[PDB]
Design a protein around this ligand. Sequence first.
Ligand SMILES: [N]S(=O)(=O)[C][C][C][C]C1234B567B89%10B%11%12%13B85%14B%1158B%12%11%15B%139%12B%1061B%12%112C5%153B%14874
Ligand SMILES: [Zn+2]
Length: 257
Amino acid sequence: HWGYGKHNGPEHWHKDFPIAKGERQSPVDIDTHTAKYDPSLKPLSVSYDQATSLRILNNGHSFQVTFDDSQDKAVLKGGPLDGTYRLLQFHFHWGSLDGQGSEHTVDKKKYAAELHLVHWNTKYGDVGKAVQQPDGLAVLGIFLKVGSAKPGLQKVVDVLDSIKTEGKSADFTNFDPRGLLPESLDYWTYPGSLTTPPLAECVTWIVLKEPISVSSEQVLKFRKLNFNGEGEPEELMVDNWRPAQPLKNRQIKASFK
Ligand SMILES: [N]S(=O)(=O)[C][C][C][C]C1234B567B89%10B%11%12%13B85%14B%1158B%12%11%15B%139%12B%1061B%12%112C5%153B%14874
Ligand SMILES: [Zn+2]
């Protein structure tokens, strides 16, 4: 199966998922001087007050927090989007050291980690149908840098020992994802793909300019996770990021001047 190692990592994925070499793959480097300010872009509408978290899961590639997406409770609208997108889950990508871990880069800068809040378009009715459409998903990406602790992340941090290895899940109710957001909703946007198999070209990316700060202790707990299942040879879940892919025939737009 696919992973992030030498023999199964990103350079291999195209064999099982040939769209890996497609025309709208993610992530990309965001060249800040080339991105064009688009005054037609709307403010992003992030409506998370009725979010209902369910479970936290280690799936062997990241950890994720899953939400009830059976009604319009935690939705993304506006910005570059037409219609309403329901929050399904969030997860992270991170490095072995603080100088790598993000998927998107900004003028070639890599952040220590990247948070992805994954949403799907309710007009396609379910996420499996949405992933087959060019406007099916909207992923909100937020960079993490290491400095001061993010208080809203601590509840996540402190349960990671209970999902150390692949397979493992736990109850994770009453988690408020508003506590993971930076002050500003200024963003870059472009059409792209899932950054993990199946690499489907179904995503409107919305990448926030302002990173959140997390502490060294917080990210160190991410790195204590394992890619492997319980009792198997221990391989730290680190460097679970896909590198930047060719931009090709795409424009990155900025919501801000
Ligand atoms: N890193 S990322 O945010 O680009 C990928 C998000 C993958 C989200 C999924 B799509 B398929 B299935 B549908 B449902 B399951 B599988 B992939 B994951 C979820 B949706
Ligand atoms: Zn992701």
